[PDB]
Structure formats: C-alpha cells, structure tokens
Amino acid sequence: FEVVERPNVTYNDIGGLKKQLQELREAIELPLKHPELFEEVGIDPPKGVLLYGPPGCGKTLMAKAIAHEVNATFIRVVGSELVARLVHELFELAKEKAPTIIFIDEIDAIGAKNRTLMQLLAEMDGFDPRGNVKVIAATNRPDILDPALLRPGRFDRLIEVPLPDEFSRAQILQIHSRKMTTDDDINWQELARSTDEFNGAQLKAVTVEAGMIALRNGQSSVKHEDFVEGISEVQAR
C-alpha cells in the first residue's frame, strides 16, 4: 500500500467543501492537537470517520490535508486491491510511524453486507481513541456497508462529500490554475456554468487540457478561450 511520510497538501488546495472539512477537523484535528481536553471533559473522539460521496470530489484530498496540518504519516489502502494479514500489518505500521492518518479507499469493496472485514473491526477496537492514529474511510455506497462498521468506536462519524456546486467549481479551476499564468479578463463564473455536474478530478483535467493548448499556441499564459476548449475537450470523456 501507498505510504507518504508527510503529504504537502494544505487546506488551501481544497476548493469548497468548507462545512465538511470543518466537520472533519472537529473530529480528527482537534482530538489530536489537544487529546487531554477530551479526557478532562471525558469524551472519546471518533476513531473512524467515513467520507462518502461521488469520486473526484476530494475525499483523498481532505485526508491528506489533515495529515499535513497535523504533521502525520499518511497511509492509504485501496479497498478493491485488498480483495486480513495485510490489515494487521497495516495498522502495525500505522502505530509504528505515529502520528498516522489511515485512509481506507473503496472500503465498500471489503465491507459490504469474511476474514479481512472482521480484522478491520478488530484493529479499530484495538487501538484506543485519544491515541494518535485515526482512520478515514472513503466510499460510494454507505447504504451497502455492513452495520458493524458504523457501530460506535469504529466509523461512527459520517460526512457527505458531494460534487462541487457552481461556485466550488470556480475555486477548483482556479486552484489548479495557481501555478500557471492567467489573463486578468478570465471569466471564472461562466466557466463554472459550462461545467455543470463536473467533479474535482475532471475540473483539474480541464486545467491540464487548457495549459496544453496555450503551450501548443506558444502563449505566455492561459487565455479564457483555452479553458473553454478545455471544458469542451473534457466533456467528450
């Protein structure tokens, strides 16, 4: 599985998702920076937080930004690529490189309603909250999950991570345009309208498509027309 010592991704790299990201920080960032306070008042922080929503909406992005802001190790697992030994080994490493944010992608692929599943429940009952290992899970179908995962002391904190709304889309386009010279007359709002029902991944792929055309034209920056051809290009996929 993929391990990143300390990912260099700030909250500044996440377009929109303000309410959710704050919910996440209340659930993970807070008990990490000040675990004693949760002991003083005497309440356990959530061991696991489930991020459900469509793909390319920034579930991974959120989990990496937390791991960044909290100076932790980021260890990611792909749920389909697990399809039990490896789960134990995982959490073992996770404890070893603490602080650690474990990100279980495609958790539904192993947690529908077997050996590997049971292991994950064990590992999470294992380590205790206030501890410096926290779990974040990502899925499409929270409906399809086995109710053992959502029971307290596991993934007992749920956060919807939906598609970018008209405005969130503007940010995401700009976000991937930052390291990239851009004309001052560029209409970011018109772009947000033409990218109806787009996701973060696709919106990033627009900026990649735009900067290509500008380069192909030997422009010194990316013009608004480039982006629209980019959106045009991206639409066909």
């Binding site: 991937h176 390291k179 990239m180 010279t181 991944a201 990033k204 792929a205 900026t207 990649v208 900067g211 290509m212 380069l215 192909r216 010194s220 920056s221 996929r237």
Partner: protein, 92 residues
C-alpha cells in the same frame, strides 16, 4: 462479439515511461490512450452494460479491468503532465 477494437501499439511501453517523458510525448500518448478507451467504450455500449452466459461475463470482466488500468494510467499521465505544466509557468 467484438473484433473491431483498435489496438494500442507500444502502449504498455510508453505507459511505463510517463514519469520520464517530455510534454510533447505525453500529448501524443494521452491522445492514443483515449483512442483506445473510445474503442473499449463502443463495445460496452453494444452489450448495453455499463462498467458497473459465462463467456459473456468473462469478457466483460476483462474489458472493465482493461479500461480501469487504462484510466489509472491516463490519470497518472495527467498528474505528471500537470506537474510538468506547472514547471513551465514557474520557469517563466
């Protein structure tokens, strides 16, 4: 009952060089990968089955697995193409 799929020459070789390609090569590659996926998708249309008898299932199982590997590669292509692209405008 497909036989009309276009085939990707030197693809698995070019795919493995994404991190070491220049931008122009990535552009040609991206276009080629997409051309391959268009052919795969035409087929997923003919069965009328989206990406989500017994010799049916096996092909569809493989068809899907192929697209996903292609999508995972094209994704990598763009993440790298993006970084190289960002280096161009910081260069300036």
């Amino acid at each position: 009952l497909l036989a009309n799929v276009k085939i990707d020459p030197s693809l698995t070789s070019r795919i493995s060089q994404i991190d070491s390609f220049k931008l122009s090569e990535l552009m040609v590659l991206k276009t080629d990968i997409e051309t391959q996926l268009e052919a795969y998708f035409s087929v997923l249309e003919q069965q009328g089955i989206g990406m989500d008898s017994d010799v049916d299932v096996l092909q569809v199982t493989m068809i899907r697995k192929n697209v996903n590997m292609l999508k995972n590669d094209l994704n990598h292509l763009l993440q790298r193409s993006h970084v190289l692209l960002n280096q161009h405008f910081d260069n300036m």
